[PDB]
């Protein structure tokens with residue numbers, strides 16, 4: 001199984017400078033958690049991180065594996081607030097380099113590693129696992145392999161917090177009393193073709209199946225559905241105000257595409273065609 005470096009890199013290696021125009025300072029690129037009403041995006045992203053890490057029963061000395069570490073905000077938070085060693089995986093060249101600098105400049109004593117590789121090329125024992133918004137890039141065809149590896153790399157009391165967007169079947173969506181449909185399907189095509197090449201959304205039962213079939217017990221499924229529309233609204237508001245900057249670094253063609261993507265997804269979550277859930281997978 002050769003990781004899909006090309007497709008994944010197609011999106012995230014666009015330009016850190018560009019993503020910085022709409023993501024919060026920690027560069028977290030996933031659904032935030034507005035635990036409190038007046039939280040800033042940065043505070044809500046940290047709260048999301050704590051929500052995920054707080055389910056792992058972390059302890060000093062442990063080694064945490066972050067599958068699809070992104071720009072590393074989660075890894076560094078794990079080190080700094082929870083005092084654990086970390087290992088981060090990503091197919092993005094720019095992310096690997098960025099996190100490599102965070103590691104190089106850290107004054108914390110814990111072990112920190114970032115690899116430009118996929119879980120498909122990682123076979124090392126870890127104490128706990130966290131994966132936020134990376135699953136959507138694996139593809140239905142590799143779900144079983146992922147959980148197999150996850151279960152194999154974890155200790156006896158191991159735990160994996162899998163956070164991923166989930167979707168309903170377009171055919172069955174019509175019964176949910178949800179109009180549009182065609183519009184939804186047409187937008188999904190747009191996303192997979194111009195935003196996330198190779199992307200694929202898993203249904204909740206699909207995650208529950210691959211987990212159980214590989215020896216895991218899903219002890220909790222928490223939805224952050226409403227929180228994503230706001231996260232996306234905040235991302236789009238910033239990008240738009242940074243429009244002039246967006247075109248300079250790239251092109252107005254890229255800008256238009258990203259605004260269409262950010263805003264569109266926001267409505268999709270608002271109406272309920274898509275969801276986002278954190279699965280506590282207990283070994």
Ligand SMILES: CCCCCCCCCC[N+](C)(C)CCCCCCCCCC
Pocket residue numbers: 029030031132133134136137165167188191192196199200201265274
């Ligand atoms: C139906 C095809 C779905 C492909 C989904 C690809 C998802 C990539 C998610 C990447 N992160 C975690 C960085 C988040 C980006 C913002 C939310 C995007 C939601 C897309 C929903 C498409 C239905």
